């Protein structure tokens, strides 16, 4: 991805040999910057609504004539708007993004009839998985605001058209926008972005209201629709070793009809439960989480004890074999993330919008057993453990039990 | 929505002769109602015609 600048907008593109191009606008407008709760989700859903040059209807009908597709999502850090189309149709897609950023008519009827109902279905579909809920609850306990803001719009706190219009005035500005083109000729994209995004406001860098503060605690989301438990440990100094540790501890199987050879995978034997360790770097803080879902609260409780033990055991001693297995699983995870268009866009988006250079999968550091055990030791001896229980919460563990 | 259901006049006919939900096991003795309707239509047609010629 050759990083450049076109009329004040950061543009990164990588040419390829495929008939299919992916163009993504990455906006510094994720939930950690959300002025009011849910606004970044609403702004994402307001993309490709009516603009002054082109109605939402006309856009969708023309997109079907190109056979293009449209993908949008919100993270804690970004809003990502992606289009996938044939290489030759690049100018149309550049101009479409320009119309969205410069000329979106934010109309109240679109909010009530189109945008908010779709936002609500989006969230309900995600929450069908209790593990999603548990990991969201864990971020809320751990960070409170900023990273602790909800990613998604919720019913209890309504977003108004004035909220969304204000946020869009901040976000849709040259300072918060990066263009990422997969299988796009980089010289051609710079020329097109330079003509199309020239009249976009310059604006200012959107910032997180307040510094990231870490907290421990418990969240007990009582649902009737499945059971899950996250054990998170907030990290004040994000370090790349936690990727290796997440992959080492593992949890999912690498093979059909198997349990797996990972410590967390072996913690589920004799139970219909699954487990997944994840590490979330957010630049200035991080979160190391272990999420366990299952149908039995008794089994979840059982696995949760084994999970905390596994982390303590790791803090004691890692073998050389295990450390190499962690390097291999981690390099692989990095590679597939840089391939997947959704995650790819945000990775280069971070490099362009902040200045955090991407770590290429081939350059993923090999951590010695000493370095891994040290990282696990810090987590087992955390002052601020978070536990989010979802489901039959009366039957799930508490932080002080773990 | 289908016109037969949407339009109030059509929907009245629909409710009696088309979508009308019937038991699946009516035997042939449930056919006398339609024969009575047939007799009534024959009597109206023949009766009005005889009225054109009768004094």
């Amino acid at each position: 991805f050759s990083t450049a600048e076109a009329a004040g907008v950061k543009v990164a593109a990588q040419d390829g040999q495929s008939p299919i191009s992916d163009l993504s606008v990455v906006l510094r407008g994720g939930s950690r910057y959300a002025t009011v709760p849910g606004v970044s989700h609403i702004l994402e859903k307001f993309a490709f609504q009516n603009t002054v040059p082109k109605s939402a209807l006309r856009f969708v009908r023309e997109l079907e004539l190109f056979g293009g597709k449209l993908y949008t999502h919100t993270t804690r850090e970004h809003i990502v708007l992606r289009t996938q189309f044939l290489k030759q149709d690049l100018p149309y897609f550049v101009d479409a993004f320009a119309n969205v950023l410069k000329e979106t008519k934010f109309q109240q009827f679109e909010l009530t009839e189109r945008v908010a109902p779709v936002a609500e279905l989006d969230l309900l579909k995600r929450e069908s998985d209790p593990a999603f809920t548990a990991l969201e609850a864990a971020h809320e306990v751990a960070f409170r605001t900023g990273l602790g803001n909800s990613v998604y719009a919720q019913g209890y706190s309504p977003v108004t058209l004035e909220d969304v219009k204000e946020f869009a005035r901040q976000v849709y500005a040259k300072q918060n926008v990066a263009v990422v083109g997969n299988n796009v000729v980089p010289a051609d994209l710079q020329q097109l972005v330079g003509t199309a995004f020239a009249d976009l406001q310059e604006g200012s860098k959107v910032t997180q209201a307040g510094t990231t503060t870490l907290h421990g605690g418990e969240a007990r989301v009582r649902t009737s629709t499945g059971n899950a438990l996250t054990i998170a440990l907030p990290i004040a100094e994000p370090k790349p070793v936690y990727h290796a540790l997440a992959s080492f501890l593992g949890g999912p199987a690498s093979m059909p009809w198997s349990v797996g050879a990972s410590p967390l995978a072996q913690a589920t034997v004799g139970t219909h439960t699954s487990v997944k360790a994840t590490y979330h770097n957010y630049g200035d803080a991080g979160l190391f989480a272990i999420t366990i879902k299952g149908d039995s609260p008794a089994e979840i409780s059982q696995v949760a004890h084994k999970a905390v033990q596994a982390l303590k055991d790791t803090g004691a001693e890692v073998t050389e074999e295990q450390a190499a297995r962690a390097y291999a699983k981690s390099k692989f995870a990095a590679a597939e993330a840089f391939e997947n268009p959704d995650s790819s866009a945000s990775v280069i988006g971070m490099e362009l919008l902040s200045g955090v250079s991407r770590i290429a999968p081939e350059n993923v550091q090999k951590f010695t057993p000493a370095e891994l055990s040290e990282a696990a030791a810090q987590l087992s001896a955390s002052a601020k453990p978070v536990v989010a229980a979802v489901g039959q919460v009366h039957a799930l563990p508490f932080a002080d039990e773990l | 929505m289908a016109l037969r259901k949407k339009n109030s006049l059509l929907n009245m006919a629909n409710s009696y002769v088309l979508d009308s939900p019937q038991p699946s096991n009516l035997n042939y003795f449930w056919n006398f109602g339609s024969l009575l309707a047939l007799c009534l239509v024959i009597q109206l047609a023949t009766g009005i015609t005889l009225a054109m010629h009768y004094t």
């Binding site: - | 339009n7 109030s8 006049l9 009005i48 015609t49 009225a51 054109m52 010629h53 009768y54 004094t55």
Partner: protein, 273 residues
Amino acid sequence: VLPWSIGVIIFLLLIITAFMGYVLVFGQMSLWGATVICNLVSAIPWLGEDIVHFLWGGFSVGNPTLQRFFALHYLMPFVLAVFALLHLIALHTAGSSNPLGITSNVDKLSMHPYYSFKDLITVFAFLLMFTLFVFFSPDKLGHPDNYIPANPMVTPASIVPEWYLLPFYAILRAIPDKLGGVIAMVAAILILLILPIVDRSIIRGNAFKPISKLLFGFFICNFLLLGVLGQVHIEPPFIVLGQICTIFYFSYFLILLPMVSTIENIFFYIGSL
């Protein structure tokens, strides 16, 4: 649109019902009116003469025609009652319109007791008019010739329909061609079916439309003049006047109402800016 369209058919059935009932007396106007009105069917190309003989049940209006008119005159009011019920059921989906032309969904009253008691006033006003004709002047609306028994030999001085059919008769006389005249006469009723299309107004009804109100006034008075011209003799200058009134009748639907309703739309918009 649907209650109005079924309404137009109710009006046609009332005309047929009343025409057949008038023949039943079998006085001079009964016979000669049946003869001339039934001979209009002879204009239907190719089969017209055959259809007339078939309707009469013979070669002129006679006993077979009278007996069949009795049977049909008895039947037609029952058919008319069914169509009257159909147009009410069709109306029930929107409810009654009202004189302001706006929705009444904001402010409804039960039919009873309010409109029950308001209907009694006009029932008694109607019964007073009924009483004055039926008891004090029972033959004012009739033709003396219908007290002479039908005589196929002697033709009455003037053969005219009952007063309520007179405007349609004037329209028919206006066209010199037989078939032309019959088409025009039928079209004068069926053209009511196009009002939903030719009225281009964004507003329902005339309460707030001064130009439409003037046009409506002229249309109604022209309809009454056509009625009068239906019973004058075919003489100057009434021949030409009947043709001008016929043109005005049709031009209301085809030209004037579409033009006036278009212009009034623009005056409401510009006038209230």
